[PDB]
């Protein structure tokens, strides 16, 4: 990493402010600095020399005192042996905005000889240099009276050039043949994009470019977007192939933390965070032994909103729900229970000893899938449901794994649908004396009322009535809900199957009547394209400006709606293969 924030390093993201540092400090870690975005501020110091042999550009995106991008003043002591003597800027070149203020530095030399109109590009920027060094020796004879120190290698200056009005403000000479490149913030040493001192936008491996290599590049061999192996990301005004070790990628740029609508993910070494499929995860506190609350009550329910993974446990006691009239507490509003529909994993256990009578199903725990059992509520139980009398079915339609512990479901005299459950399939490991199911609603009653597992479920069982409550189906499924068929030959969405789960076909497939429409999710599996064919792929519109490896690629649609590359010398695209169509 050659970049370091402002408020070892080559680029400075911010202001470089050096004040109060002692005389004997090793200032050599500033030896590699090349460009600084903000301003440069040096005051109240006591060292003798400033060394910037590699500094070339100070962009001055922020000016100090409202006028200056470089501000040096009062770097000396009154009654000790420490003061500034030289500014060793043997390779400094340009300042993009602001002026220069150097004043009241007792023994700073050579500043009167160097012409300031060259570095600063703002003509009417205030540049004042007074009451600075006193008995300064003359500049060296090799340097023609234009140097930074008495040395013979510390004298650049020069660079002053006039300009033709064609190039406007960015040029390297007065002739009409001498306009700088478009991507250059100031002056250049040549017309090329690799000769400019600073870039308007980004510097990649020496050149000034509008944007860094895109993550996706059109490949004329595959007729499709394909990953680019020579990608670079945005870190400030520098294109880098990998963000700093602590950083993460946002879209095409680096950031310390991904925005709340995306979550940091690792994809084979490269760390970038994609947008969340609806909403992003969040961990919240549990309930019980180890938490702050004996139960879930009206004083902790708001903090569980938008939570995805409960590091801990959940207790639903009567006192939290019914309130506590002895110690003034508001009773919990039952319609607020829907905040648990976002929960996916419970680290430890689940304890339910009371539930609202109007809610016969725990459907507020639909998206719950995992109960780890790393901690147990009571006796070795990772799941406890007792004395719930006005409850019909469970409703944990996506619950698939109880990692460890045991299960307690008793005294629920109106609970059905639980009788035919293959508990070996959910709880992992032994079923030798790990099930406590008694005193509920008898099998004899549930079967008579018609409350058994739906015949669409497999031999494992179900959490309740209907299709969307099966553990596993007997044939197909869609959206966690069992079905009899996917929409193969007809239906609202034409679909395909992959290991007994229906997925929607690619939207570019043409809906086929009486025969299969697509084989997989990609557009290379359609039997026939709905609009246009870009090789084997179905596309909405033909390529018209996509970025290729050799250049932008332009194609035209066929009468049979197949895109073909247009001739090598169109620019505005094409409506056909002929030259008349550009």
């Amino acid at each position, epitope marked *: 990493q050659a970049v370091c924030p402002g408020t070892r390093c080559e680029v400075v993201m911010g202001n470089l402010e050096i004040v109060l540092t002692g005389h004997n400090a090793d200032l050599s870690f500033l030896q590699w600095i090349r460009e600084v975005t903000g301003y440069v501020l040096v005051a109240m110091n006591e060292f003798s020399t400033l060394p910037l042999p590699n500094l070339r550009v100070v962009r001055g995106t922020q000016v100090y005192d409202g006028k200056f991008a470089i501000f040096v003043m009062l770097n000396y002591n009154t009654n000790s042996s420490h003061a500034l003597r030289q500014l060793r800027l043997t390779q400094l070149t340009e300042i993009l905005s602001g002026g220069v203020y150097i004043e009241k530095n007792d023994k700073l030399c050579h500043m009167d000889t160097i012409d300031w109109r060259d570095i600063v590009r703002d003509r009417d920027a205030e540049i004042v240099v007074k009451d600075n060094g006193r008995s300064c020796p003359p500049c060296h004879e090799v340097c023609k009276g234009r140097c930074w120190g008495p040395g013979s290698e510390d004298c650049q200056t020069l660079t002053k050039t006039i300009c033709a009005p064609q190039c406007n403000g960015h040029c390297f000479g007065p002739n009409p043949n001498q306009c700088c490149h478009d991507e250059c913030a100031g002056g250049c040493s040549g017309p090329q994009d690799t000769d400019c001192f600073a870039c308007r936008h980004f510097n990649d491996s020496g050149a000034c470019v509008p944007r860094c290599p895109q993550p996706l590049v059109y490949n004329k061999l595959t007729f499709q977007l394909e990953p680019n192996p020579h990608t670079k990301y945005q870190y400030g005004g520098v294109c880098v192939a990998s963000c700093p070790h602590n950083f993460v990628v946002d879209q095409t740029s680096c950031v310390r933390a991904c925005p709340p609508d995306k979550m940091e993910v690792d994809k084979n070494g490269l760390k970038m965070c994609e947008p969340c499929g609806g909403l992003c995860p969040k961990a919240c506190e549990g309930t019980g032994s180890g938490s702050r609350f004996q139960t879930v009550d009206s004083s902790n329910i708001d903090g569980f909103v938008n939570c995805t993974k409960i590091l801990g446990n959940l207790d639903f006691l009567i006192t939290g729900l019914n309130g506590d009239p002895w110690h003034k507490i508001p009773a919990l509003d039952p319609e607020k229970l829907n905040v648990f529909r976002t929960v996916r994993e419970i680290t430890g256990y689940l304890n339910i000893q009371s539930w609202p009578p109007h809610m016969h199903n725990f459907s507020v725990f639909s998206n719950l899938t995992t109960i780890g059992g790393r901690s*147990l509520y*009571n*006796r*070795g139980f990772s799941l406890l449901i*007792m004395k719930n009398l006005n409850v019909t079915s469970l409703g944990f339609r996506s619950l698939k794994e109880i990692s460890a512990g045991r299960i307690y479901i008793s005294a629920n005299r109106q609970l059905c649908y639980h009788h035919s459950l293959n508990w070996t399939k959910v709880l992992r490991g032994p079923t030798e*004396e790990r099930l406590d199911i008694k005193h509920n609603r008898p099998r004899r009653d549930c079967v008579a009322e018609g409350k058994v597992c739906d015949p669409l479920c497999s031999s494992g069982g179900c959490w309740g009535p209907g299709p969307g409550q099966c553990l596993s189906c007997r044939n197909y499924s869609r959206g966690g809900v069992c079905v009899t068929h996917c929409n193969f030959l007809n239906g609202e969405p034409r679909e395909f199957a992959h290991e007994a789960e229906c997925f929607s076909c690619h939207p570019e497939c043409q809906p086929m009547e009486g025969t299969a429409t697509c084989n997989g999710s990609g557009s290379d599996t359609c039997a026939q394209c709905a609009h246009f064919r870009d090789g084997p792929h179905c596309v909405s519109s033909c390529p018209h400006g996509v970025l290729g490896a050799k250049g932008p690629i332009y194609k035209y649609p066929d009468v049979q709606n197949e895109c073909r590359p247009c001739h090598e010398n169109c620019t505005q695209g094409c409506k056909g293969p002929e030259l008349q169509d550009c």
Partner: antibody, heavy 124, light 108 residues
Framework: QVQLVQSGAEVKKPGASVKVSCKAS????????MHWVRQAPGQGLEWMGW????????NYAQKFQGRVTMTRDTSISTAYMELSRLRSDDTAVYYC?????????????????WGQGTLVTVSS | DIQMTQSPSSLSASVGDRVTITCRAS??????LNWYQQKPGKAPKLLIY???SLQSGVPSRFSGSGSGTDFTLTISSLQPEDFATYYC?????????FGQGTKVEIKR
């Protein structure tokens, strides 16, 4: 005060049946479960079963399940245990103990009050 | 049946010593283990329930510790009323089980 009084010593022949009582006084009889534990002479302890003195629910141990019938009489606050199909290895001192929890699910099954012990000698 | 193992079988200690008996569970039993004292020929007395909780009436020298598999009943400064036989009881499984019993004896 809480006090559990059992019946006198019994002497049975191999094959008979014995029904030992346990008269409770000093607490709500239907509030706490009643445990039965026997101890062979010079041996360890052995748990046989508990009784819910309010509902009548039983929970016998697998070793004794089938030849032990424990009941209750709330009108006089007395618990009974009838061990039939006797053997010479059933000779022990049979204690009756009280569960220390009114709500049994949160009880730790610790016996805070015991009876005086009833000796039941079964020999030919 | 989660068979309990008490150690040691017998123990010879004098008045004023710190003694330590160990009740080991066959499987993990969380914290559901009790301790009892039985005078010879008399009904057992409840000392510590719930691994550590001291029963009301029992002196402060009686203390229990441990969880899961290895439990420990530690009493400091033996007293003349404390020379008897001690059993540990598990209440985790549906069939409870007692230990073989440690018998502390007066050193002489």
């Amino acid at each position: 005060q809480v006090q559990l009084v059992q019946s006198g010593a019994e002497v049975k022949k191999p094959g008979a049946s014995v029904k030992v009582s346990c008269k409770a006084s000093g607490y709500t009889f239907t509030g706490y479960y009643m445990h039965w534990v026997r101890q062979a002479p010079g041996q360890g302890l052995e748990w046989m079963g508990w009784i819910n003195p309010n509902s009548g629910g039983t929970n016998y141990a697998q070793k004794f399940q089938g030849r032990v019938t424990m009941t209750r009489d709330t009108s006089i606050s007395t618990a009974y245990m009838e061990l039939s199909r006797l053997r010479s290895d059933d000779t022990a001192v049979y204690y009756c103990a009280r569960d220390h929890g009114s709500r049994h699910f949160w009880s730790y099954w610790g016996f805070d009050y015991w009876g005086q012990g009833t000796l039941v000698t079964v020999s030919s | 049946d989660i068979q309990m193992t008490q150690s040691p079988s017998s123990l010879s200690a004098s008045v004023g010593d710190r003694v330590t008996i160990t009740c080991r569970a066959s499987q993990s039993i969380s914290s559901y283990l009790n301790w009892y004292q039985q005078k010879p020929g008399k009904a057992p007395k409840l000392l510590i329930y719930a691994a550590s909780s001291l029963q009301s009436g029992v002196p402060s020298r009686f203390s229990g510790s441990g969880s899961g598999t290895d439990f420990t009943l530690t009493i400091s400064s033996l007293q003349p009323e404390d020379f008897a036989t001690y059993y540990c009881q598990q209440s985790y499984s549906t069939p409870p089980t007692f230990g073989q019993g440690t018998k502390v004896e007066i050193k002489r």
